[PDB]
Amino acid sequence: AYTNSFTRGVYYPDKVFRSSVLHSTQDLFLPFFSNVTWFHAIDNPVLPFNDGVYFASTEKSNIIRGWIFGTTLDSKTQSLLIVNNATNVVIKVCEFQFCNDPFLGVNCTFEYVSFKNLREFVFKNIDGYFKIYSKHTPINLVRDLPQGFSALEPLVDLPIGINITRFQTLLALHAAYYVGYLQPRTFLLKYNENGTITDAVDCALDPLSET
Amino acid sequence: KCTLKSFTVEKGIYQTSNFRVQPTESIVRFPNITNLCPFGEVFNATRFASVYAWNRKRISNCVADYSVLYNSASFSTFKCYGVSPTKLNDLCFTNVYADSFVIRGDEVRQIAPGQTGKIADYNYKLPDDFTGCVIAWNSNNLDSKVGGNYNYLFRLFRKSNLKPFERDISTEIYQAGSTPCNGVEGFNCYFPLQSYGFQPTNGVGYQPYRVVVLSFELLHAPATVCGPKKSTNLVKNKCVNFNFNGLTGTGVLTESNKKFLPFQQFGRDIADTTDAVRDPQTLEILDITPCSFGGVSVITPGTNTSNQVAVLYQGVNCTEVNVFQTRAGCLIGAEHVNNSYECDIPIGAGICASYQTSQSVIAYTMSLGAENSVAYSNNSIAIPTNFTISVTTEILPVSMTKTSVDCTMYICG
Amino acid sequence: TMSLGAENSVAYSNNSIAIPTNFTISVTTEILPVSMTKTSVDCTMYICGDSTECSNLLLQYGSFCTQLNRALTGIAVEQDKNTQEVFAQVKQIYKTPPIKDFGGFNFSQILPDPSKPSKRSFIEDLLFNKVTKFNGLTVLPPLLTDEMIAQYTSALLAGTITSGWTFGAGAALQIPFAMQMAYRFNGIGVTQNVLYENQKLIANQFNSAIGKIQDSLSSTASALGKLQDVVNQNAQALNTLVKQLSSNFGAISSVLNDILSRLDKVEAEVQIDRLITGRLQSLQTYVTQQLIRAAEIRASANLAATKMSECVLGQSKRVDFCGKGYHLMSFPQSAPHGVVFLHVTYVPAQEKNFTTAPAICHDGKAHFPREGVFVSNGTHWFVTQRNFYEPQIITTDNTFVSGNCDVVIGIVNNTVYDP
Amino acid sequence: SALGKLQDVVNQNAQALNTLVKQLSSNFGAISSVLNDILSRLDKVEAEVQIDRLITGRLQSLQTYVTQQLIRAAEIRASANLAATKMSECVLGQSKRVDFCGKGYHLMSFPQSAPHGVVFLHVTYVPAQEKNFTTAPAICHDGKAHFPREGVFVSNGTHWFVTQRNFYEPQIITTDNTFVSGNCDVVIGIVNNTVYDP
Ligand SMILES: *[C@@H]1O[C@H](CO)[C@@H](O)[C@H](O)[C@H]1NC(C)=O
Ligand SMILES: *[C@@H]1O[C@H](CO)[C@@H](O)[C@H](O)[C@H]1NC(C)=O
Ligand SMILES: *[C@@H]1O[C@H](CO)[C@@H](O)[C@H](O)[C@H]1NC(C)=O
Ligand SMILES: *[C@@H]1O[C@H](CO)[C@@H](O)[C@H](O)[C@H]1NC(C)=O
Ligand SMILES: *[C@@H]1O[C@H](CO)[C@@H](O)[C@H](O)[C@H]1NC(C)=O
Ligand SMILES: *[C@@H]1O[C@H](CO)[C@@H](O)[C@H](O)[C@H]1NC(C)=O
Ligand SMILES: *[C@@H]1O[C@H](CO)[C@@H](O)[C@H](O)[C@H]1NC(C)=O
Ligand SMILES: *[C@@H]1O[C@H](CO)[C@@H](O)[C@H](O)[C@H]1NC(C)=O
Ligand SMILES: *[C@@H]1O[C@H](CO)[C@@H](O)[C@H](O)[C@H]1NC(C)=O
Ligand SMILES: *[C@@H]1O[C@H](CO)[C@@H](O)[C@H](O)[C@H]1NC(C)=O
Ligand SMILES: *[C@@H]1O[C@H](CO)[C@@H](O)[C@H](O)[C@H]1NC(C)=O
Ligand SMILES: *[C@@H]1O[C@H](CO)[C@@H](O)[C@H](O)[C@H]1NC(C)=O
């Protein structure tokens, strides 16, 4: 299955305040109108990670609750495991072994701890640092990933030093989710009077956006 | 006189060196954290890693006295990149990552940005814009043994080179060619790791050396590691010299309405100059405004006629500096006049100055000329009954001095 | 493929002339830049940001910084001279009488309104609405305030209305405005009675042409494009100079206080010298392009000063100088960094074709018109003024003889009356 | 005080050459600003670095001089094109252009040479002793409107005269100094005087 990504998945590029200004930046971003892959859990395979991932879910009862990242995912080498329920988060890079069907029932060189709704996330890996950005918003459209703009804000940055080429989501059992891949892109970002990134241009989308 | 390189001064207005308000006080605001960083658990540690599997220690939430490191005789090398060790005591960082391992004394030169070779490519790669220090010392009295200390290893083979801070503990047999290796050694099929086997009799390049590399998380993010420094009271609405988390400057700090999102520590202008900050102890957003400045113009009749003088502080308000406020700036030594006259020396924003009656420099709103109601009506004409021949002189430039520069003789003598 | 315009076969023959039977009074707005914002960049504080360390490295370069301040100061003093040469062409501040007895012409939109905090005209209030600091950069005020510029445009305009051109050549001599316009008609070769006989029409054509200026200026945001372009060029130049503070030029940072708070002096000097070299080159690029741009604004201020003298203080014979059509008159209106001329021009507008012959035979003598053209309706021959169809009976008072009938290529046999 | 236009051309070119000469004494970041001093203290491997800073700075200093002389030459050329136009229009001619050749109505001009320039002695007619009169755009004779051929109608208070515009010279109003056009009733401000028949 497939759908249009629209303008989703912009995130705050740096921890600097700016206002009433059109800042231009190059980074790993989800391109505008990119071809988003769509999955229905009510459906969590291993997937390539490429240059990083945008991930999102339309939400009503919080069914989607974690992720795996790494290469062979079979205890021969390390894997970054992330497990979440919004009150708590658990993260480790151990040489884990995984089953036929990774799900949640309702050398660890690093370890770390902490429809009605649309949840958006971005995952990227640069110079051994692994980074996560986030957003949540109420919605009324049940059908599909909504047209409109709202930027993702940073949460987590981990100095793990470990290679990633594949990833997989984790599901709760006694709901649908989206995937798109980031690319190296240049974006023009509209910081408003309150420092909200209210709008953007993907400079490589079309000749008008390049203008 | 000195500005003009001259003993005469002609009638005019002359911009002498500019005015700046000076900072009244110097201010410092670091985080109010109380821990002291665990560097003894690094530099006085019993063990150091095999270089193929270097350790990393996060330093955070603590005071770091780097002078305990660089004042110590214990270290044989202390290179620093993007920083000098002397200045680390005055800086602040989000985190510091201390990376550590054992190598033989010859390999220390591969532990730098821009390097290549087995260590730099297969064991530990620094980013070329590494801001940080490389600290190293001989340990042949600690890390060496009769018959050889084999306990420290390095990676001799990998199929691809490491990216910056990429780490890889894989034990797989290195396949050099067409020969199928399948996890056993043979021709073209080699085990990836080797020992140094340190013996006390080794020459200095083959002796064991300990290494620590300090990598600074130097960012717009809030700090958690900071140098040993006092923090002052905070001053507002008055020009001060300041330091927030090692960002030095000079300006009028004020309270502000800038709606910083919780992750943001600074706000930047078009020039990348910081024009708001968050105080690291009490989380208020302060606007930063430049300390007041402007030109100083000296207003004078010519030295052929008088030596009394007036001064304009351009754009300045007289509270910041006879004294007289104008739209052009604070005007000093001029007599403000209620009359108006033609413009002798132009001050700006409708103001002019002249030397007048017992005499002094006056300053006034300029007169555009006499006001005149022309005696118009639908039937009134004026016709001139007599004339005058004028002979008005006009002067025009036509040429300038022809010059030629032999640029070879000028540049090279 | 672009069109150069509509095609036109001009209906030429050795005997066909078109004479225009009616006119339109055009008012055509011309906009000119006259000045630009008097910037001044403290090159020590731009390059070095109140660092003592950088400020002393900048003394290695000698007088590069003082000749940059000298260049921007000469640009700034020229902008007051550019403004003085355009508007200060009037020696006394003339003012209009209390009663507007101007023969039906209605200047209320271009003369001052007393109610405003600066007494601009209504059209000057439209012009001022349509046209739109910390890194050692400063802006100096102009010598003349916008209220003094409006007193000069009011004095120029009150002299122009009450006295004709005479306030340029001597003291202002009063003259009734409908009599001044009858001189402006002689100045374009239209016999002055054409104005008095069409006076109420001409006054309404002028007043409606002024009404189209209000509607155009109120509605159409692109109207003042030249002044807005000059404002945008100077804003873009400063935003370029300011963003060039954030460039590294090969230093470790573009923030001069990072360099001084991280490096010891022996290394800091090497990195600061890359910033000095690049910022000095950036400021030399800014000042060189502002000298080239000031030379273009000075060329436009010298043109605006020449249109003030020749169009406002005079009436111009120069084709297309004071608007399109034959120039009658012009009025200056102040605008941000510029001047606007409301060029009033006579345009002929309703041609008739006629037969024409260069000379006339009577008693074997060749007659030529003293002032006018010979023309015929098809059977009767009339001498006519050359820019407005008024046929007059051909008579020994409106014609002069030279030679006999034999010499002239196109002469026609006719009667000529003798008074 | 008048000659400040030509004396400023001399002063600007003296200031430009003195700036170019004093800029030889600047280090530009070399050990010295004396080229022979570098070459008499250093061996060539060291000296080439120090000399290249003097070359870089003297080259930039000379490029700055030549660029400001190009911009100043364009400013003097505009003034030479203006002086060549005042020579043609006002020495070789009489200009109808208002305030082109002195304030007042231009009669004539004379060129005098001066250092790096020209001085024009613009001779101009200025009217000097105004007097007020009553005026009217036309005169109603035999029900004909009359208008002046050249000049203006005025009255001393009781009698009507025509004059040229720029010098009071009252002439009796006659069919030689006036032309007819139509009936009186069209004209805003016509007056019921006589007109004489010569
Ligand atoms: C996504 O890609 C497929 C081909 O793999 C194409 O048929 C489909 O139309 C694309 N959808 C969008 C939203 O572009
Ligand atoms: C969240 O998960 C943790 C284990 O990861 C568990 O201890 C905790 O009780 C859970 N809380 C909720 C609200 O589900
Ligand atoms: C951890 O790594 C070591 C080598 O460093 C290896 O011998 C060991 O088998 C690994 N641990 C597990 C649980 O396999
Ligand atoms: C900025 O935020 C305030 C609330 O903090 C809000 O009232 C205001 O409308 C916002 N402005 C804009 C342009 O959204
Ligand atoms: C740190 O700052 C807070 C104010 O934000 C204050 O309440 C607290 O007592 C301070 N702690 C120390 C150790 O100074
Ligand atoms: C200038 O000063 C001298 C004396 O130094 C004096 O003789 C001369 O008259 C003065 N000239 C003017 C124009 O004031
Ligand atoms: C000058 O500064 C004082 C504050 O020091 C302020 O009260 C006053 O309004 C200012 N006046 C002007 C004209 O800037
Ligand atoms: C200026 O004139 C006003 C009265 O119009 C008077 O109050 C004021 O004191 C005068 N100031 C000076 C400096 O003469
Ligand atoms: C004049 O006559 C010619 C006859 O061919 C015609 O083409 C032209 O349009 C006429 N022009 C006017 C103004 O009547
Ligand atoms: C004018 O031209 C016509 C032909 O177009 C010709 O018949 C006639 O003779 C010419 N007249 C003169 C005076 O040349
Ligand atoms: C003309 O007459 C008016 C009458 O009010 C008078 O004000 C004006 O000064 C007179 N002008 C001349 C030049 O006589
Ligand atoms: C001139 O104006 C007055 C009122 O100011 C009026 O009474 C008179 O009739 C007018 N005369 C002419 C000739 O328009």
Author numbering:
A (entry chain B): 27 to 68, 80 to 143, 165 to 172, 186 to 245, 263 to 299
B (entry chain A): 300 to 620, 641 to 676, 689 to 744
C (entry chain B): 696 to 827, 854 to 1140
D (entry chain A): 943 to 1140
Study authors write:
Changes in the spike (S) glycoprotein in these variants are under scrutiny because the S protein has a central role in engaging the angiotensin-converting enzyme 2 (ACE2) receptor to mediate cellular entry and is a dominant target of neutralizing antibodies (nAbs) elicited by either vaccination or natural infection. The prefusion SARS-CoV-2 S trimer is composed of S1 and S2 subunits separated by a furin cleavage site. The S1 subunit contains the N-terminal domain (NTD), ACE2 receptor binding domain (RBD), and two subdomains (SD1 and SD2). The RBD transitions between a “closed” (“down”) receptor-inaccessible conformation and an “open” (“up”) conformation that allows binding to the ACE2 receptor.
Spillover of SARS-CoV-2 from humans to minks, and then from minks to humans, was first reported in April 2020 in the Netherlands and subsequently independently reported in Denmark, Spain, Italy, the United States, Sweden, and Greece. To understand how these affect spike conformations, we determined cryo-EM structures of S-GSAS-D614G-ΔFV (“ΔFV spike”), which included all but the TM M1229I substitution. The 3-RBD-down states were ~43% of the total population, with the rest of the particles constituting “open” states, including ~47% 1-RBD-up, ~7.5% 2-RBD-up, and ~2.3% of the M1 spike. Thus, we observed a modest decrease in the 3-RBD-down state from ~56% that we had reported for the D614G spike, and the appearance of open states (2-RBD-up and M1) that were not observed for the S-GSAS-D614G dataset. Upon closer examination, we noted unusual variability in the S2 subunit of the ΔFV 3-RBD-down structures. The variation in the S2 region was unexpected because the S2 subunit had appeared relatively invariant in prior studies. The I692V substitution occurs in SD2, where small changes can translate to large movements in the NTD and RBD regions. Structural analysis revealed destabilization of the 3-RBD-down state and loss of tight regulation of its conformation in the mink-associated ΔFV spike. The triple mutant and B.1.351 spike structures, as well as ΔFV 3D-1 and 3D-2, clustered with D614G spike structures; the B.1.1.7 and ΔFV 3D-3 structures clustered with u1S2q; and ΔFV 3D-4 differed markedly from all others. We can infer from these structures that in the virion-associated spike these changes could have an impact on spike stability, possibly leading to premature S1 shedding.
